[PDB]
């Protein structure tokens, strides 16, 4: 199975320390007016794991819903998940153990947009986002992950649902695997994640802000 | 080349929160009186990367000097090191870039003894030790890593030097590779390291306590 990922890429109610990370409602919405962005791991062109299935400018931020498809990547995650003491401990009641989702939840807890200043380039899964509020929520059902975020209106969800339900090209009768990296890369990426100062308070901050306190796989 | 690792496994001047982690001078020294301990990664029997070359009860703690030998492990570290943004940034002047040492320095910053309550079982490299003062200092020269710790006396160093200079069995004319794990395991281990609450202040604490503020590869 593929894994779906939801979260904000930017937030309108959050003001970044680094002013370059500003991304207001006027700018985001005009950009969405101006064929589907790649999903990579720590902005590595060789670590594309899928695509952004939906994008929606909602009350509080730019929300997106990416799709992790790569068999090569998900197979790395599978083998690595069976060697984590965190994953072994399990998820909160009443969720079923899902080693693959739990590992991604732990390892790639953040979202990071790559944008100008076409205006959006791609989205990266990463340990923590530099913009606050950018918690990554993984799960098998996209309707389910989108429901993790309680402040999304039914108006917002409909706009999102429209995008991830939209059928791709009927032409090619296979699903390509974009992933051109390895577990060595993902291991290389891991050290860096350890040296982001106070990662876990940043993640805790993101969690309560976006109200992901509602059963989730989030490890923070 | 192999890589040497120095650090305390316990400290006499540090009192653990968990009383089970007590390990006093009487007990440590009597245990050293009662064929060389394996060095593994996060206490995984399949992740032996070498051996403890020396052990010395000094003024402040149980100090040890392990040796990371595995070609299979060091080759994983090599490939992963070329994919770290931390490793790319380099070490402090005036040290030469050493991607392998830098990665281990970042990734496995802690030491963890496995002991009773024969009394010592093995030593694990890990992200952070649960006992404080247990900073891992890596480097190519064992005389050099031992010199990172300024509070070790020349009496202490001589006792250590004796042990790592002592010739092994002249019988077998090869050096075996104990490592029976993979990069998937090391990747699996990495998530857990992310969820140790305030890892970096613990590491900073260890660093100044043992006076590793003297050019080092330590990333904390």
């Amino acid at each position: 199975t593929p894994v779906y990922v939801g979260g904000f890429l930017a937030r309108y109610d959050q003001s970044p320390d680094e002013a370059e990370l500003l991304l207001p409602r006027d700018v985001v919405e005009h950009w969405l007016h101006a064929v589907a962005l790649p999903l990579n791991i720590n902005h590595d062109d060789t670590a594309v794991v899928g695509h952004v299935a939906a994008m929606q400018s909602v009350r509080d931020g730019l929300f997106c819903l990416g799709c992790v498809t790569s068999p090569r990547f998900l197979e790395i995650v599978r083998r690595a998940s069976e060697k984590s003491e965190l994953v072994s401990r399990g998820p909160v009641s009443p969720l079923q153990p899902d080693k693959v989702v739990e590992f991604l939840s732990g390892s790639y807890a953040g979202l990071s947009l790559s944008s100008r200043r076409t205006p959006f380039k791609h989205v990266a899964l990463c340990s923590v986002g530099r913009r606050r509020g950018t918690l990554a929520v993984y799960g098998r059902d996209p309707e389910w992950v989108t429901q993790r975020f309680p402040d999304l209106t039914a108006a917002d969800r409909d706009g999102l649902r429209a995008q991830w339900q939209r059928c791709g090209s009927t032409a090619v009768d296979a699903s390509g695997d974009p992933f051109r990296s390895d577990s060595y890369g993902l291991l290389g990426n891991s050290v860096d994640a350890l040296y982001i100062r106070e990662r876990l308070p940043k993640l805790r901050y993101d969690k309560q802000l976006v109200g992901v306190t509602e059963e989730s796989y989030v490890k923070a | 080349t192999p890589v040497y690792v120095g650090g305390f496994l316990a400290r006499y001047d540090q009192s653990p929160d968990e009383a089970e982690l007590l390990l006093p001078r009487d007990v440590v020294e009597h245990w050293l009186h009662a064929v060389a301990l394996p060095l593994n990664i996060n206490h995984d029997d399949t992740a032996v990367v070498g051996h403890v070359a020396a052990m010395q009860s000094v003024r402040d703690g149980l100090f040890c000097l392990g040796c990371v030998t595995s070609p299979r492990f060091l080759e994983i570290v090599r490939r992963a090191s070329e994919k770290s943004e931390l490793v790319s940034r380099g070490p402090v002047s005036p040290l030469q870039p050493d991607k392998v040492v830098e990665f281990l320095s970042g990734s496995y910053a802690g030491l963890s003894l496995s002991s009773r309550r024969t009394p010592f079982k093995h030593v694990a490299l890990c992200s952070v030790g649960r006992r404080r003062g247990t900073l891992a200092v890596y480097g190519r020269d064992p005389e050099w890593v031992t010199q990172r710790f300024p509070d070790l006396t020349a009496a202490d160093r001589d006792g250590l030097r004796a042990q790592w200079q002592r010739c092994g069995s002249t019988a077998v004319d090869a050096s075996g590779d104990p490592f029976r794990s993979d990069s998937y395991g090391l990747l699996g281990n990495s998530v857990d390291a992310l969820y140790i609450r305030e890892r970096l202040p613990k590491l900073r604490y260890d660093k100044q306590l043992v006076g590793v503020t003297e050019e080092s590869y330590v990333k904390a």
Binding site: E20, H43, L113, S114, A124, V128, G129, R130, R131, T134 | -
Partner: peptide, 13 residues
């Protein structure tokens, strides 16, 4: 490009 990342901050365009 500007990213919302800690390590890969800018990106060629």
């Amino acid at each position: 490009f500007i990213t919302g990342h800690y390590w890969v901050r800018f990106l060629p365009c």
